[PDB]
Design an enzyme around this catalytic site. Structure first.
Site, PDB file in Angstrom:
ATOM      1  N   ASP A 148       1.111  -0.973  -0.096  1.00  0.00           N
ATOM      2  CA  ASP A 148       0.271   0.169   0.252  1.00  0.00           C
ATOM      3  C   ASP A 148       0.923   1.063  -0.127  1.00  0.00           C
ATOM      4  O   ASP A 148       0.232   2.869   0.119  1.00  0.00           O
ATOM      5  CB  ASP A 148      -0.916   0.038   1.458  1.00  0.00           C
ATOM      6  CG  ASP A 148      -1.910   1.121   1.620  1.00  0.00           C
ATOM      7  OD1 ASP A 148      -2.838   0.872  -0.072  1.00  0.00           O
ATOM      8  OD2 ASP A 148      -2.290   2.059   2.681  1.00  0.00           O
ATOM      9  N   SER A 207      -7.328   5.325  -1.490  1.00  0.00           N
ATOM     10  CA  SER A 207      -7.059   4.175  -1.688  1.00  0.00           C
ATOM     11  C   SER A 207      -8.793   3.359  -1.500  1.00  0.00           C
ATOM     12  O   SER A 207      -9.299   4.183  -0.302  1.00  0.00           O
ATOM     13  CB  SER A 207      -5.734   2.874  -0.462  1.00  0.00           C
ATOM     14  OG  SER A 207      -4.867   3.404  -0.551  1.00  0.00           O
ATOM     15  N   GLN A 238      -4.883  -2.349  -6.907  1.00  0.00           N
ATOM     16  CA  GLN A 238      -5.768  -0.631  -6.279  1.00  0.00           C
ATOM     17  C   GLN A 238      -6.080   0.455  -6.825  1.00  0.00           C
ATOM     18  O   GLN A 238      -5.561   0.900  -7.413  1.00  0.00           O
ATOM     19  CB  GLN A 238      -4.742  -0.596  -5.355  1.00  0.00           C
ATOM     20  CG  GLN A 238      -4.667   0.838  -4.570  1.00  0.00           C
ATOM     21  CD  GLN A 238      -4.175   0.323  -3.134  1.00  0.00           C
ATOM     22  OE1 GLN A 238      -2.203   0.863  -3.352  1.00  0.00           O
ATOM     23  NE2 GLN A 238      -4.310   0.524  -2.551  1.00  0.00           N
TER      24      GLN A 238
END
Ligand code: NA
Ligand code: NA
Ligand code: NA
Lengths: 252, 256
Positions: free
Chosen positions: A168, A190, A240
């Site tokens: 991440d 995100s 993502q």
């Protein structure tokens, strides 16, 4: 150093854990929750999650684990990470016994070895734009070399839960490479995470995070990553989506 | 048939029921699970992602019930979870995200060089036109083990309901992507245990499933009884409209 303690949860009850905000941190601790409820004969191979709310970094997070199935070969878990009675992250994860099948692998991409430097405990390094090998028709590419400075115990969980964490870190960045100009007018965060764990690695040794963002629009961007050991092995794949939004008034 | 995915009986708030090859049943169930999600969402918010896990086989001679959870309802984004249930068992579990029309940075990858469908040759694909790019015409990328390109199109015109189109595309991907794992393994196929384990999808731009879509696919890896696959879907005018990742079972029996 820090990462072990981050991923050391307190068990409050069966299917109830507590970790004492970086999206990777919630993600990583949710994954640890799941893992601590599964027979270790089954190892994690995928996870999907939605970042629903912003964490309060100054408070603990409670993890409520659901034992979705337990079969002969695969086990499946869902985790809701909670703070102040609200779910901040909701995750699924699947786990499989050691089994056998067909074999293949994409070759490692062209990359310089590890280089400049982008989390004191990590050694992170970005590829400079002029050293990047373009691939056909691809709008937005980023390569990142990372690794833990200090060696880490051999526990695969830790290494996977640590890779969840670092995954991440730079990925969504790849979507803004060609948009340096509008970087003071973007709402960025995100939205989701999806990861596939395929092969072993020493997270204390060099990893190439080859990243790409194949699309952006409607106030979102999609990013895609491949993780490799220097010797050419594909360790994991990541996808993502994230918020990349102009304010209500603003037009480029 | 594809329009029947949209046909759900509503049993109560957040409870829906769908009426009575395994990959086909799985794709149906997944599609209906999404449609269930969509019925509990303010239509100002349109779907943009979904992730789910194929837990169990089910029985295609029994109906399925869909249990929707209104996970989050905010100003820009709504999130749902859905469990598809048969005889007390969760057979499929899923999440999806919905967003209002908003704005942001713009870009997309270029459509890969493919040959047009019209000069390519190509019982469950009866509604569809399907044309598989020959190994010799496929534009390969560097270091790739396993690529496949397929053009597809619903033969007959469809209603103008974008949800139906999304389901159409999600359905055909559930039928066709995991095949890309087998491209280089054709001697081993008959021995394999094959299943869909998951799928993850991102719906980026509007399209039409009764017009040509190019599915640019790849299997970047397989091992441990699994195979990962991945693809992007373009319109013929070169617009990138969806991305998909899916893992499957591709397992040797204990003996072989
Ligand atoms: Na089994
Ligand atoms: Na809706
Ligand atoms: Na919101």
């Amino acid at each position: 150093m820090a990462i072990e303690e981050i991923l050391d949860l307190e068990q409050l009850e069966v299917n109830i854990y507590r970790g004492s905000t970086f999206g990777g941190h919630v993600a990583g601790q949710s994954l640890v929750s799941a893992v601590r409820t599964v027979d270790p004969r089954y190892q994690v191979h995928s996870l999907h999650g939605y970042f629903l709310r912003s964490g309060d970094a100054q408070e603990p997070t409670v993890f409520l684990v659901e034992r979705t199935r337990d079969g002969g070969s695969f086990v499946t878990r869902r985790v809701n990470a909670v703070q102040h009675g609200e779910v901040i992250f909701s995750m699924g994860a699947s786990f499989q016994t050691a089994q056998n099948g067909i074999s293949h692998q994409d070759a490692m991409p062209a990359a310089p070895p590890p280089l400049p430097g982008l989390f004191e405990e990590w050694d992170v390094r970005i590829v400079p734009r002029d050293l990047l090998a373009p691939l056909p028709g691809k709008a937005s590419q980023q390569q990142v070399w990372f690794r833990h400075r200090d060696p880490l115990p051999d526990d695969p969980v830790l290494h996977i839960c640590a890779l969840a964490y670092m995954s991440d870190l730079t990925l969504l960045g790849s979507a803004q490479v060609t948009h340096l100009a509008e970087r003071e007018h973007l709402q960025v965060a995100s939205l989701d995470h999806a990861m596939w764990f395929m092969r072993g690695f020493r997270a204390d040794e060099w990893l190439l995070y080859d990243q790409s963002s194949p699309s952006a629009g409607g106030g979102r961007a999609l990013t895609h990553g491949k993780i490799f050991t220097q010797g050419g092995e594909l360790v994991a794949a990541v996808m993502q989506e994230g918020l990349t939004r102009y304010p209500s008034g603003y037009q480029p």
